Design a protein around this nucleic acid. Structure first.
Lengths: 839, 49, 902, 58, 126
RNA sequence: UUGGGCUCUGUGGGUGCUUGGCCGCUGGCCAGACCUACUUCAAAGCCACCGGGGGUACCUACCGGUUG
């Protein structure tokens, strides 16, 4: 197919070590993940992700209160700024320090930033968006003032409301007031008196009093009055009080000045909020067992945003309604596996932490959590209905959920207690195939009754990965006994055919045309077989085609290094012509199934917290104490809860201590999508959802020389030869033009043009009508289209049935959306109104 | 080896699938989504001796 | 100017002018070496390597003649007023202008040098010195030296300052004289003459570390150093020839380094500009010579294309480093050691660029989406025969590519002092390059060192082999290049014919590299092994597709299915690769003559530049021409597609760039350049465009203002039931708004105190939310119902948020029982109106269901609404019948198609 | 000797299951002692096959 | 230095060690040549890898082969196997790996046994 | 191609997107300068990781008392 997959959106991880933001419009939420920033539009449920990707993880996110501009800064101080409404990246710029503090003035003319001690204020750059005849400058920032009046970490800064003074809350129990420009009746001044360093300091609305809130939970209100001896006045404290949190510190502090109310989150994972100037406790509640890393507030002041670092645990809390706005939970140990749904709407993930969760593709959310398993959860799968889901997890239970009533309407377990590493289901929705790692036998249970059916056996080792051929004729096993094994079950003999390989198996796949199997073994090569005539027909040795390495404490050269040279998981294209294949590496590879050559190679992550994202480390990282990314930096922590190391000596797998500084990047799963056009990869960067990029690329199908957009419009308008115009439009293959003509033609000539249309073009046509039926609101018209289409070309469509497989599936989901979208309401309304009409 | 299966009971309600989900400003589910009761007609009633 | 690209940077250049560079010490540690690009100034730290510290914005409209560095600021005098160009003097600091200066109006002299001291700044133009008060930046006065001869009056040499004198500057004449000027009252106070007046013109002068002791350098050959208050000669040196005048000197200020034991002091360095060799004297006994750094820069030559000649030399103060720059785009730094005494220093930094204009340019393809993007490595093949991996990111990670120890092989030959030159010892000037980086494994590709250009596989096949092929000028070998090791590689193929290589392209898989001869042979090598896979043709009719003319413009279809060959004369032949045979030829022989091809992957697109000044684009999948562009008035110099396929860009010999929107087949952009562009290129992100001009060395780089801001230009030049745009989400939560509130309640309740603080402070916009937009929706509906057009109230109902919408709908009523008063009935009439208008069926049914759910009892209690209800019911019956019939029909037959065989 | 064993598994010739292992405290439970074996491209494994004379170059 | 590839092939009880190094081009068995070692009909089964591969491949290397164990036809299938896995391994280790993968495609697509001693053990119908 | 080669050993850039050196920083300094003044009022609480079983006279922590 058309294989040019630019990077569409991040997904499924939801908050990283970072700082939350609101659009000043008050609706959209900016939040950092890894090294990209996703936006959640809240009003319409939507999310996306920008096209940049820093190297190290995000550390600061500041906005231009106009709304259009964004500056995000990484650890070690690399910085990127983007224009938001046109999502492009503008500039790259290097602070010489690892940034900690950041705020833009509400006037939107300068910003202040707090590096490890130094304080800075730079201008804002004149954007090509903002000047009419404008250009990218070279040096886009100009540096206004620096300040070295200060003795420790500078941990928060905040502008005034008149954009003339700003407050600097330090880490050395001090705060300082600073002039934007040289005022007359003024001295830049200090404020001292706390007991453990201040986290926040802000102006009042009427900028006379200022608050500070200091780390042991002590809030001080200061006024600029005379000394107690009465020209002479002095910044002193009018009064003070303390949050009565018994047994922690607060880490996070914020406060709306317009509505005079303050919020503070503490290390025990409770937060509270207060009507400030009178100091009454509005209320308080515990969100999360770990702690709060960052709190920030609505521009209007209705909403509160909490980011909890150590988990996903974003939550946005409406306070005056005492209600959640959302409570999301990105995963917190890695993701063993995933699938799409035969809906195509949404994807389901299964982590090794214990929760499984259903993400929606649009709107970036885990719609549902289930936490019925007590252990790490490996593989996940779907029966062809797409309403039953099967998980298999280390606790020894295959749980079988229903997803339209949300309950585990079975569980399964082997007699002697086993631990399923791998599984799948028959596509019947009637039989479950599981494979352990303790006992090599491969069990099969009946769905419809649950009691065990058959322990298949034959295997000289544990059985490594399993799948049913999508028709349901064949179960396929691969085991580490060098061997792959065709189990034909539902035949009356339940026969077995061996297949000798070269080494251990790792992952299996089928073709939707159920004749072909693709098995990915341990040397790394793929071997491609035809099922019936069990003969190998193709093979690809892709070791150098996947090696990317050089982790921390990986003392082989990145080339030589063992164990990053095999595909942990392959998967087939929905059109049935291209493998996708990713695993313990840096790269995802994309292979041609027949020509056997490499289509494409993607890198999974540009990040540098992770280890294996660059195939050469560097000298000036290496110190005479080994690599610098091995120092147990735990001692320099301020919190005891951060000084402890409740680790375990030597557990690769699930160990709660979570030492988890500098981990690997394993492409633990990949999956295409049942509408084609897009796939995804489960990585420890979260989950990445790639799609094709059509609209950003002009692609002529089989063009001529006389077919311009204007030519199409002319023959559309003057000549009105609608069939000819349409076939030219598709031939040109551009979205806006095809949209235009499709909207233009009359809904009476529709039968004429479709009856005279060419069937080579007809599938691409079907797809386009699907996209229109979904997202454009001209529903009835699009339905007349799809009616005439199938009514004209039934037997050709039924004749092929497979060459259009994605087009079929997308039109079916489209009319399903319409179906469940409207006709339920229509019938329900007419029934109700008929009843009340009939009294 | 994990453990022998100890039997565990867990109660479900009469309220809907939206009550099962987590917290977010919209339900993803459709409009016929929401009026299903998370339990079955069997659960609310079956005739019996 | 351009309607698309803005000149973003003249990248690839460090010192192309004869301009004296400038260096201000800082700290106790750091130095700023600052030279002029030729349009803007640039500054370079010394301790942090030589990494580019500053560039200057905005550029000046002229060439920059003069620059100097003071406290932090840089003074830049630009402009040659004798020929048209306006001039001036600016002050930058951190690369942005902080000041301009008032100039004398009557200043028709280009301005040679600037000099800053006391509190005054000094401008030496051509014959006339202007001065400013630097404290207020004001023009103070203007000085004029006088002479009997229009020769003799010319201010050459220069004007410096005595270290400890008071407000005196020292000027030299075209005549051999030096004139001391008290600049305070603007008064010539002394004049000095040289011994043996056969010495003609003072060339350069500089104050020594000694007291009151100056070095004047005559064109006539003697240097001399003098007590500038006793006017007695202190040392005299026959130090230049009449052919080779000393033109810049610098003294070492260290304390040690003379007397053949390194311990004593008094070392000085002298430089010409007719050679590139610098010379070191030891002053001590009578001023003996001590050595020659032979050919620090490239030796200058008038017959040769290779630029040379040395601009200025500074011994930086206190330290034995000594910075040199020349003409040939090179800034090097040298240092003496100690414990071996060194007559001549060794090099301890260097930064270079080309010595000629950039002949070919080529962006490197994507490091897949990783750290590069596509836009980090711009590869430049340069007419001084080199090849440069340019960074665009960090302009100190740009590195020349080594051909092996070329400098050593020279210096063990004799090419340095005075049988060829260094650029002759390199590999010949580069015709066209082509690359891939599927398999260039970075540095440790083939461990151990591997031979160069010579004409084992477990280890390569683990890491990575050669990756950038290059065809040179007239050598029938085609070279390879490692890119991971920045170095030349080990394969250098012939042609098979023996004729000179014309072009070369490379696989997608990076394995194959096909060379294209001017005889017509088209050969294929497997790069990793240095071997010879397929000849074209091997051995329509097989064994015969042989190109008569030169073969220029091959490219691989990215599946390794077809190769596509472009003859010079005539035809394009698609070959079946794996066979090695002609599959399909297409012929434009009797009218055209194709010069080159550019290929777009992902869209199966080829573009051909052909000699009738035309560009023919053919979609290779369908083998028939799709476009032919007609814009050129000069011979096409270069041309390349933008990776969207939306533009194809070209610059002919007519010094004009044109850009066609490809799918619209139109002329979008066109502009004129000061020099015709000789090599364009396009980065793989659509962001940057690269170009190289003719005569200036170093490239221009443009950005894409179309990508950044919407540019509405398209100027071809010459010189039925719909729904509404509501978030379906928004009405979905409106439909279900009870239970979503129930679930968005937390399971645990918040811990309110006992004394709940009553009257929570006001929030949102005026006590209500921020999402309800601002201008009695009762008044809205009632006025629509007094009228007929409900549309204002209706679009307002669209304009509600869900909770406000639900609240508004629950707050409806009958009221007074009069017909015009009931929100309920008029709402029903509104919904009927929307239905017959056939506009918002979705929102209609939505509001219908919810309203019925929350008003059922009252509307059962009344009937005066129920008649309009029945009317609505009829319309609903018709519409739902038609629509549900359609949708159920369709979905069912689609199910039957997906699963027929039951 | 278990010293030299530490040296081997630090260079990384020693696989478990299907992964390589660097952490020299990977506590081998009794179900995994039967599996922990040599890695794919190992000069060690090829040395063994050299001594016992089956040295498959494929 | 002097290139060496040493390969195995196997069948029920034959064992076929074969060494493949640079040479003139001869092909030998125990110390006798190829067209002679056989039950004189099966020499096509011996020839098959050279005839799939084209001899212009084979004119680089020299192939000693030893054999023992088992009956004639066992030995014969062993020798064809060691021939093939030989020449593909030498292409793997001393010329371009792309020519390896193309050669492996030609071989495997003809038959599987020519690279893999896919043996016969016992598993009937249970 | 009018010496060749191995091996070792230094220096310099690179191996991550280019905004200066320093200081008491809205300024100055890079040759530095002035060097000790000024003061109304100590403090809010909690927690704060040593391997298991075991003894406990003395020390300690706590808890409850007793005289002075």
């Amino acid at each position: 197919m058309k294989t040019n997959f630019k990077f569409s959106n991040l997904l499924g991880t939801v908050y990283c070590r970072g700082n939350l933001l609101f659009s000043p419009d008050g609706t959209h939420l900016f939040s950092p993940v890894g090294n990209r920033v996703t936006v959640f539009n809240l009003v319409e449920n939507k999310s996306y992700t920008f096209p940049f990707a820093h190297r190290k993880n995000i550390s600061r996110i500041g906005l231009t209160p106009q709304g259009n501009l964004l500056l995000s800064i990484d650890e070690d101080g690399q910085a990127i700024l983007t224009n938001v409404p046109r999502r492009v990246v503008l500039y790259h710029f290097s602070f010489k320090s690892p940034v900690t503090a950041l705020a833009f003035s509400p006037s939107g003319r300068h910003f202040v930033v707090g590096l490890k001690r130094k304080i800075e204020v730079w201008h804002v750059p004149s954007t090509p968006d903002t000047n009419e005849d404008g250009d990218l400058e070279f040096a886009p920032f100009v540096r206004h003032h620096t300040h070295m009046q200060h003795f420790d970490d500078v941990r928060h800064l905040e502008w005034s409301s008149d954009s003339r003074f700003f407050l600097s809350a330090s880490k050395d129990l001090t705060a300082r007031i600073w002039s934007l420009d040289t005022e007359e009746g003024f001295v830049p001044t200090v404020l001292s008196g706390h007991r453990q360093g201040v986290v926040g300091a802000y102006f009042s609305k009427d900028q006379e009093t200022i608050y500070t809130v200091s780390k042991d939970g002590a809030v001080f209100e200061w006024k600029y009055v005379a000394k107690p001896g009465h020209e002479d006045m002095q910044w002193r404290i009018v009064n003070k009080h303390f949050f009565m949190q018994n047994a922690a510190t607060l880490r996070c502090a914020a406060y709306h000045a317009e509505s005079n109310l303050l919020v503070a989150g503490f290390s025990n994972g409770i937060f509270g909020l207060y009507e400030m100037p009178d100091f009454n406790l509005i209320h308080t509640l515990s969100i999360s067992q770990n702690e709060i890393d960052f709190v920030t507030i609505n521009k209007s002041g209705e909403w509160l945003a909490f980011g909890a670092s150590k988990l996903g645990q974003l939550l946005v809390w409406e306070w005056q309604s005492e209600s959640y706005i959302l409570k999301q939970q990105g995963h917190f140990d890695a993701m063993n596996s995933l699938v799409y749904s035969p809906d195509g709407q949404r994807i389901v993930t299964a982590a090794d932490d214990g929760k499984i969760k259903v993400w929606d593709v649009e709107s970036g959310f885990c719609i549902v959590t289930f936490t019925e398993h007590t252990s790490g959860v490996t593989a996940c799968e779907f029966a062809k209905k797409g309403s039953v889901l099967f998980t298999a997890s280390l606790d020894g239970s295959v749980r079988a959920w229903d997803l339209i009533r949300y309950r585990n309407f079975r569980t399964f377990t082997a007699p002697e207690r086993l631990s399923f590493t791998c599984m799948a289901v028959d596509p019947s929705g009637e039989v479950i195939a599981a494979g352990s790692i303790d006992s090599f036998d491969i069990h099969i249970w009946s769905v419809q009754t649950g009691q065990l059916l058959d322990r298949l056996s034959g295997h000289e080792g544990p059985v490594s990965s399993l799948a049913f051929a999508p028709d349901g004729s064949v179960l396929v096993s691969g085991s580490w006994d060098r061997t792959a094994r065709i189990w034909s079950i539902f035949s009356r003999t339940q026969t077995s055919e061996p297949l000798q390989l070269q080494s251990d198996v790792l992952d299996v796949a089928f073709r939707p045309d159920s004749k072909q199997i693709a098995i990915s073994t341990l040397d790394g090569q793929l071997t491609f077989w035809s099922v019936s005539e069990a003969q190998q027909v193709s093979g690809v040795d892709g070791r150098r085609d996947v090696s990317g390495g050089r982790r921390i404490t990986d003392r082989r050269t990145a080339a030589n290094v063992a164990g990053t040279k095999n595909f942990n998981t392959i998967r087939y294209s929905m059109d049935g012509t291209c493998l996708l294949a990713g695993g313990n590496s840096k790269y995802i590879c994309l292979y041609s199934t027949t020509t056997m050559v490499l289509l494409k190679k993607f890198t999974v992550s540009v990040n540098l917290s992770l280890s294996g994202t660059q195939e050469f480390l560097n000298s000036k990282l290496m110190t005479e104490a080994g690599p610098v990314g091995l120092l147990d930096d735990q001692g320099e922590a301020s919190d005891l809860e951060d000084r402890i190391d409740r680790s375990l000596p030597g557990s690769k797998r699930g160990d709660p201590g979570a030492r988890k500084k500098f981990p690997e990047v394993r492409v633990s799963g990949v999956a295409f999508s049942p509408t084609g056009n897009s796939f995804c990869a489960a990585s420890t960067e979260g989950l990445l959802v790639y799609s094709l990029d059509n609209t950003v690329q002009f692609d002529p199908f089989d063009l001529n020389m006389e077919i311009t957009p204007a030519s199409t419009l002319a023959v559309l308008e003057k000549e009105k030869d609608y069939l000819k115009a349409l076939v030219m439009a598709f031939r040109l293959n551009e979205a806006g033009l095809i949209t235009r003509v499709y909207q233009a033609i009359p809904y009476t000539d529709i039968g004429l043009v479709v009856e005279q249309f060419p069937t080579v073009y007809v599938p691409r046509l079907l797809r386009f009508v699907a996209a229109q039926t979904e997202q454009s609101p001209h529903m009835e018209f699009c339905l007349l289209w799809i009616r005439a289409l199938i009514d004209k070309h039934g037997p050709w469509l039924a004749a092929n049935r497979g060459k259009v497989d994605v087009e079929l599936r997308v039109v079916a989901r489209a009319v399903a959306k319409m179906r469940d979208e409207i006709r339920r309401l229509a019938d329900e309304n007419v029934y109700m109104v008929d009843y009340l009409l009939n009294q | 080896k994990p453990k022998p299966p100890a039997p565990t009971l867990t109660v479900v309600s009469d309220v809907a699938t939206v009550a099962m989900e987590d917290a977010q400003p919209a339900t993803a589910q459709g409009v016929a989504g929401g009026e299903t009761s998370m339990i079955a007609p069997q659960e609310v009633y079956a005739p019996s001796k | 100017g351009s309607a698309i690209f803005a000149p973003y940077r003249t990248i690839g250049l460090i010192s192309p002018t004869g301009v004296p560079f400038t260096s201000i010490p800082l700290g106790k540690t750091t130095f700023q070496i600052t030279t002029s690009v030729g349009r803007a100034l640039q500054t370079y730290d010394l301790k942090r390597g030589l990494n580019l510290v500053f560039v200057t914005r905005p550029q000046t409209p002229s060439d920059i003649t003069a620059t100097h560095a003071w406290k932090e600021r840089v003074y830049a005098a630009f402009g040659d007023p004798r020929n048209g160009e306006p001039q001036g003097l600016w002050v930058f600091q951190r690369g942005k202008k902080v000041a301009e200066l008032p100039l004398p109006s009557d200043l028709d002299q280009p301005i040679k040098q600037i000099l800053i001291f006391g509190g005054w700044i000094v401008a030496c133009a051509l014959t006339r010195i202007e001065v400013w008060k630097a404290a207020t930046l004001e023009h103070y006065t203007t000085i004029f030296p006088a002479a009997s001869k229009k020769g003799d009056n010319e201010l050459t040499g220069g004007a410096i300052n005595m270290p400890t004198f008071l407000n005196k500057i020292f000027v030299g004449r075209k005549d051999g004289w030096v004139e001391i000027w008290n600049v305070s009252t603007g008064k010539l106070i002394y004049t000095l003459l040289p011994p043996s007046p056969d010495c003609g013109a003072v060339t350069c002068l500089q104050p020594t570390p000694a007291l009151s002791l100056l070095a004047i350098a005559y064109s006539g050959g003697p240097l001399v150093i003098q007590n500038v208050l006793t006017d007695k000669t202190v040392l005299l040196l026959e130090a230049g020839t009449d052919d080779a005048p000393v033109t810049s000197i610098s003294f070492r200020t260290d304390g040690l380094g003379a007397g053949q034991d390194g311990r004593k002091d008094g070392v000085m360095a002298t430089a010409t500009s007719v050679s590139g060799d610098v010379t070191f004297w030891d002053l001590n006994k009578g001023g003996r010579i001590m050595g020659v750094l032979r050919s620090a820069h490239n030796p200058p030559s008038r017959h040769n294309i290779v630029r040379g000649g040395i601009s200025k030399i500074e011994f930086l103060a206190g330290q034995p480093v000594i910075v040199t720059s020349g003409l040939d785009n090179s800034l090097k730094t040298w240092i003496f050691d100690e414990s071996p005494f060194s007559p001549v220093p060794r090099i301890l930094h260097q930064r270079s660029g080309h010595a000629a204009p950039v002949r070919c340019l080529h962006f490197l393809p994507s490091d897949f989406d990783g750290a590069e993007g596509g836009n980090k490595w711009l590869l430049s093949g340069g007419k001084d025969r080199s090849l440069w991996g340019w960074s665009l990111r960090r302009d100190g990670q740009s590195a020349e590519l080594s051909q092996g120890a070329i400098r050593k092989k020279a210096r063990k030959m004799g090419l340095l002092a005075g049988t060829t030159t260094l650029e002759d010892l390199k590999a010949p000037e580069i015709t066209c390059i082509a690359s891939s980086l599927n398999r260039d494994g970075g540095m440790g590709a083939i461990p151990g060192k591997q031979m160069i250009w010579d004409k084992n596989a477990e280890l390569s096949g683990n890491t990575g082999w050669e990756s950038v092929v290059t065809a040179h000028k007239d050598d029938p070998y085609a070279r390879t290049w490692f890119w991971g090791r920045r170095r030349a590689g080990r394969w250098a193929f012939k042609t098979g014919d023996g004729e000179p290589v014309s072009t070369v392209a490379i696989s997608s898989c990076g394995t194959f590299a096909l060379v294209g001869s001017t005889g017509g042979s088209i050969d294929m090598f497997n790069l990793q092994s240095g071997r010879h896979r397929q000849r074209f043709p091997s051995r329509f009719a097989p064994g015969t597709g042989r190109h008569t003319n030169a073969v220029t413009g091959i490219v691989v279809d990215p599946l390794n299915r077809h190769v596509v060959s472009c003859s010079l004369d005539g035809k394009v032949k698609f070959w079946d690769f794996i066979t090695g045979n002609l599959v399909d030829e297409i012929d434009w022989a009797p009218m055209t003559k194709i010069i080159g091809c550019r290929y777009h992957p992902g869209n199966d697109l080829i573009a051909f530049a052909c000699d009738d000044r035309s560009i023919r684009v053919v979609d290779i999948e369908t083998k028939n021409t799709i476009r032919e562009f007609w814009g050129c008035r000069g011979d096409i110099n270069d041309f390349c597609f933008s990776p969207d396929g939306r533009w194809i860009v070209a610059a002919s010999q007519d010094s004009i760039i044109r850009v066609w929107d490809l799918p619209t087949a139109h002329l979008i952009d066109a502009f004129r350049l000061e020099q015709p562009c000789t090599a364009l290129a396009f980065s793989h992100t659509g962001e940057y465009l690269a170009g190289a001009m003719e005569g200036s060395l170093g490239v221009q780089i443009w950005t894409n203002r179309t990508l950044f801001r919407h540019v509405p230009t398209r100027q071809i030049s010459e010189s039925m039931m719909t729904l509404s745009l509501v978030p379906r989400s928004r009405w979905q939560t409106l439909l279900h708004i009870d239970i979503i509130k129930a679930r968005n309640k937390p399971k645990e309740p918040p811990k309110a105190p006992e004394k709940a603080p009553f009257f929570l402070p006001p929030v949102g916009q005026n006590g209500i939310s921020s999402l309800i937009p601002q201008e009695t929706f009762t008044s809205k509906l009632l006025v629509g119902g007094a009228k007929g057009d409900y549309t204002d109230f209706i679009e307002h109902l669209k304009a509600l948020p869900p909770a406000a919408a639900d609240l508004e709908l629950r707050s409806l009523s009958i009221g007074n029982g009069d017909e015009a008063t009931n929100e309920l009935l008029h709402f029903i009439r509104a919904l009927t109106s929307r239905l017959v208008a056939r506009r918002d069926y979705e929102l209609t049914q939505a509001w219908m269901t919810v309203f019925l759910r929350l008003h059922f009892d009252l509307i059962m209690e009344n009937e005066e609404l129920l008649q309009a209800l029945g009317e609505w019911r009829e319309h609903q019956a018709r519409e739902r019948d038609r629509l549900s019939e359609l949708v159920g029909y369709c979905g069912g037959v689609v199910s039957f198609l997906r699963s027929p065989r039951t | 000797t278990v010293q030299a064993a530490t040296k081997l598994i630090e260079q990384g010739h020693v696989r478990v299951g299907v992964e390589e292992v660097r952490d020299p405290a990977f506590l081998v439970t009794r179900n995994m002692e039967d599996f922990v074996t040599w890695t794919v491209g190992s000069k060690i494994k090829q040395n063994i096959m050299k001594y016992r004379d089956k040295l498959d170059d494929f | 230095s002097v290139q060496a590839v040493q390969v195995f092939g196997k069948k029920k009880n034959a064992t076929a060690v074969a060494r493949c190094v640079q040479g003139k081009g001869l092909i030998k068995v125990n110390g006798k040549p190829l067209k002679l070692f056989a039950p004189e009909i099966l020499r096509a089964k011996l020839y098959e890898p050279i005839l799939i591969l084209g001899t212009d491949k084979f004119a680089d290397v020299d192939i000693r082969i030893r054999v023992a164990g088992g009956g004639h036809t066992s030995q014969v299938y062993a020798v064809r196997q060691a021939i093939a896995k030989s020449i593909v391994a030498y292409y793997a280790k001393y010329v371009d790996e792309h020519s390896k993968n193309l050669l492996k495609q030609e071989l495997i697509q003809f038959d599987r046994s020519l690279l893999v001693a896919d043996p016969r053990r016992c598993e009937p119908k249970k």
